[PDB]
Amino acid sequence: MGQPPAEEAEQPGALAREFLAAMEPEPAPAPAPEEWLDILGNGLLRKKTLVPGPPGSSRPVKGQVVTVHLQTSLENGTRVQEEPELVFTLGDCDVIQALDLSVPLMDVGETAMVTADSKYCYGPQGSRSPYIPPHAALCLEVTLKTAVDLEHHHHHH
């Protein structure tokens, strides 16, 4: 005996033969989850560690001006902007909020590819080189190469 019988009836009218088949799941190279860790758990802003800190890294604090290298691709793959070094005030929205958060989520020395909705990038804002289309999903690769402490002014409560 093979399998336990769980099939009742014969033909309810239709049958549907092997007519249209284009759903064949064959093993594809590069197993990527596609949907990574969403920074806000909102679905639009996700950070993927290419490398997550080679040495005994440290995550810069908001306030420290950190050097990021970003080269940003469009959701189709078109890299619209490249900048080998951008030093900005973390947490002070000195950048795109996607990045401003991704850095604290990044350890020093790592390179994270973040896909963030243009709304966290340059949706109705537009990017320096290309005015990035609104709510277009930006995929930016940021190298946190350096972090330096330069924030000791003011306070908030």
Secondary structure (DSSP) of 61-116: PBTBEEEEEEEEE-TTS-EEEEEEEEEEETTTTSS-HHHHHHTTTSPTT-EEEEEE
How many CB atoms lie under 10 A from the CB of residue 140?
24
In terms of Cα–Cα distance, which of 133, 113, 134 is closest to 48? 113
Torsion angle defined by CA atoms of residues 79, 84, 68 and 93, in that order, rounded to the nearest 10 degrees = -70
Which domains are assigned to the chain?
1-157 (3.10.50.40)
Q: How many CA atoms lie within 13 A of 78 on its CB side?
A: 8
Binding site membership for Ca(2+): which residues? 92, 94
Task: Give binding residues as ranges.
Answer: 92, 94
